[PDB]
């Protein structure tokens, strides 16, 4: 039959093959060439300081036991053939829970050229660890890494490399950005060696630079806190006799300021230190108690227009303006 030619080629390739041994176990070093096609940089979850990335992981290596001579130069086979030959044991160092998609068939690729060069592509939704220093929250930038290398294979056995130039070995698709909060500034790769309890391993690093956009928090936290301060600023224009009016001004600014303080923290994790949003909330909260203590002293000194009210109608909004022009110019630049 016509298809018998490829069947006997594959059965001659797999005859006498040991898939437990890497190519050139006692003779040379197995060089595995790697590149990543990031199909969609998924959402970054701050609560767990993690991020999801869907990639077309691609590896390539030279195997001398898969040489053939036939009518076709490249054998584009299925996944079944991938489990019967040696494949490198690449694992992600900082991955948490990643799935190799297998719907409707296992998403794998295997192309055996006539000189023995292989190509092994897979789809991996890698959930990795992105450690965060949120001292400048929300006006911060992160470099979420993606470190991968070969388990059970020392530097003297399996080394890794990028198949193209390292500037062009991690390609992010143009439509592929599922980031709603951040935006992806650029990619960054590096290759190094790690010395672990067992031996020295080659690790390949990919840093994804991110930058948080201040659009959700300049409408949920910053602007409501500014409006809460300004609503405490209008209580100085009221009458000295209207004690319940300025009283409900003070207590409602205190309650709205503290419920903004509570509901603002239900966003980032429970870090021990205090972010820039915490400093803004603290200063605005102190301005609200200053507005309340001003009315308390006025009610202590009541019996004419108060000089305390006339001084606080001028000093308090200009001090708020100086605080804003200090804080925003310190943290945005």
């Amino acid at each position, epitope marked *: 039959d016509n298809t018998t030619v490829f069947t006997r080629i594959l059965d001659r390739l797999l005859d006498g093959y040991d898939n437990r041994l890497r190519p050139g176990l006692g003779e040379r070093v197995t060089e595995v060439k790697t590149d990543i096609f990031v199909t969609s940089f998924g959402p970054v979850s701050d609560h767990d300081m993690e991020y999801t990335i869907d990639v077309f992981f691609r590896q390539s290596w*030279k195997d001398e036991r898969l040489k053939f001579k036939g009518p076709m130069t490249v054998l584009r086979l299925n996944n079944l053939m991938a489990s019967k030959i040696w494949t490198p044991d690449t694992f992600f160092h900082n991955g948490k829970k990643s799935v190799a998609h297998n719907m409707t068939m296992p998403n794998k690729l295997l192309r055996i050229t006539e000189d023995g*060069t292989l190509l092994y592509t897979m789809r991996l939704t890698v959930r990795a660890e992105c450690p965060m220093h949120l001292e400048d929250f929300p006006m911060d930038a992160h470099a979420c890494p993606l470190k991968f290398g070969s388990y059970a294979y020392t530097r003297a056995e399996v080394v890794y*490399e990028w198949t193209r*130039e*390292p*500037a062009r070995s991690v390609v992010v698709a143009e439509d592929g950005s599922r980031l709603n909060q951040y935006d992806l500034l650029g990619q*960054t*790769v*590096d*290759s190094g060696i790690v010395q672990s309890s067992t031996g020295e391993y080659v690790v390949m690093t990919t840093h994804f630079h991110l930058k948080r956009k201040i659009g959700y928090f300049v409408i949920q936290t910053y602007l409501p806190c500014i409006m809460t301060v300004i609503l405490s600023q209008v209580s100085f224009w009221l009458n000295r006799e209207s004690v319940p009016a300025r009283t409900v001004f003070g207590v409602t600014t205190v309650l709205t300021m503290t419920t903004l303080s509570i509901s603002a923290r239900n966003s980032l994790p429970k870090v021990a230190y205090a972010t820039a949003m915490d400093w803004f909330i603290a200063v605005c909260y102190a301005f609200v108690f200053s507005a309340l203590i001003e009315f308390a002293t006025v009610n202590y000194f009541t019996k004419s227009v108060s000089k305390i009210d006339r001084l606080s109608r001028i000093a308090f909004p200009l001090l708020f303006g100086i605080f804003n022009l200090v804080y925003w110019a310190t943290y945005l630049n």
Partner: antibody
Amino acid sequence: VQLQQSGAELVKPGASVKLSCTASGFNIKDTYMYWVKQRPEQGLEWIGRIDPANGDTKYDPKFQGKATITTDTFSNTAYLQLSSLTSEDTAVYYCARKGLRWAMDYWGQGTSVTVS
Amino acid sequence: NIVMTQSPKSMSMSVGERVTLSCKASEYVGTYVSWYQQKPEQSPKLLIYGASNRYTGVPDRFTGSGSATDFTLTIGSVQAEDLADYHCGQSYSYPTFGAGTKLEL
């Protein structure tokens, strides 16, 4: 393991020169081949890149058009094509094999071109 | 492109002391530099790959170092046969080269 180049060349300006180097001990389909320009008493200048398994060639923006790199499979050889030779093209040329961690491992002996 | 700005042009000292080099990058190249020696009437030879990886046949006196942007090549007790010219390259992008540091007596 040995990269043997051609001999020295001396032609008139505005002409064309064929330049070549042959790699032995391995195959060029595995590693990239790099061409470099070394002006006398000057630094190294990268000419271009060729992938012999794919045929894809990448060049420096300042060397596009005047220089192109070709190759063949049977003879295991890389070729240069230089056109519109001038006084500033008088240099010595090496072909460099891409090595471990992209480091320009092996180098040829060098062919000195001269115009008159 | 990536611009290599290695400094200085040449150094002139004696035999048997420490001399250091420097290779400053305009943009990020991450541990992908390379150092070569250039004798007169001689092709370049590889010395250091990666950031600090000694090639086979390199003596132990040749010690490199590297970072994200700043690179250097430290020589310990340089001898008379090492009077050559040193070049710093990069290969994180399409490869470029520096000017060249010479050695003199």
